[PDB]
Design a protein around this ligand. Structure first.
Ligand SMILES: [Ca+2]
Ligand SMILES: [Ca+2]
Lengths: 133, 133
């Protein structure tokens, strides 16, 4: 039985449904930053491909990552959905953003195809955290 | 004109062709570790989705990442090709491996759909390295 804190806004998501099916014990809180907290250091920010693209368009992505890093020593970003075929932005803009966050800011960016996969990632990371704590 | 060192085995790849089209000046060397060296600290390991899966099956992925980290302070892994629909392995095995490399080992894992995209990533990172050096 792994324990994960979930931000109130994610409560009725399909991610939460899968986490519950996986046996995760969820504690609800309204977080200023982050969507799923695994430990005092590990926090996960769930972001749809569309919202990632929008944050690049509006130039707010880096402020977002900064806020995550300042709140957690080991933040993780799970980008959910395909980033391909999503016009309104040159591929280099998306690639450049990804490279900046992962290599410069040092914040891992794990890609998920569905909310279920996002839950599976949260679950496996939380399980490792529990076993290693 | 950005400069990148490329391992001899990558010389006739489509990645090298695109890098040359992008104006990158390549110096060929036979590297013990890594495929493309951007700086004394930044090195890139190009790995096909199939080879990543195989390394998980044979349990050699972590040794590979260890070798990269010991050779470069800021290594990067570019996984080229789709990891979905590639049976012979449960999705959790791939997810778990990705999470371990990016979160535990702290080695960024950038996903590329083609050798051309891999070149575009190498190029943009190398350009930033040059501008910031
Ligand atoms: Ca979110
Ligand atoms: Ca390689």
């Amino acid at each position: 039985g792994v324990k994960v804190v979930v931000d109130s806004r994610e409560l009725r998501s399909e991610v939460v449904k899968r986490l519950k099916l996986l046996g995760v014990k969820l504690e609800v809180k309204t977080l200023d930053v982050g969507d799923y907290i695994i430990s005092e250091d590990v926090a996960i920010e769930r972001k749809s491909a569309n919202d990632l693209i929008q944050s690049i368009i509006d130039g707010g992505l880096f402020d977002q990552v900064k806020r995550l890093k300042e709140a957690y020593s080991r933040p993780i970003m799970i980008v959910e959905g395909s980033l391909y075929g999503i016009r309104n932005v040159h591929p280099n803009a998306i690639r450049g953003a990804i490279a900046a966050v992962t290599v410069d800011f040092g914040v891992p960016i794990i890609f998920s195809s569905t909310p279920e996969e996002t839950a599976q990632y949260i679950f496996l990371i939380a399980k490792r955290e529990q076993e290693e704590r």
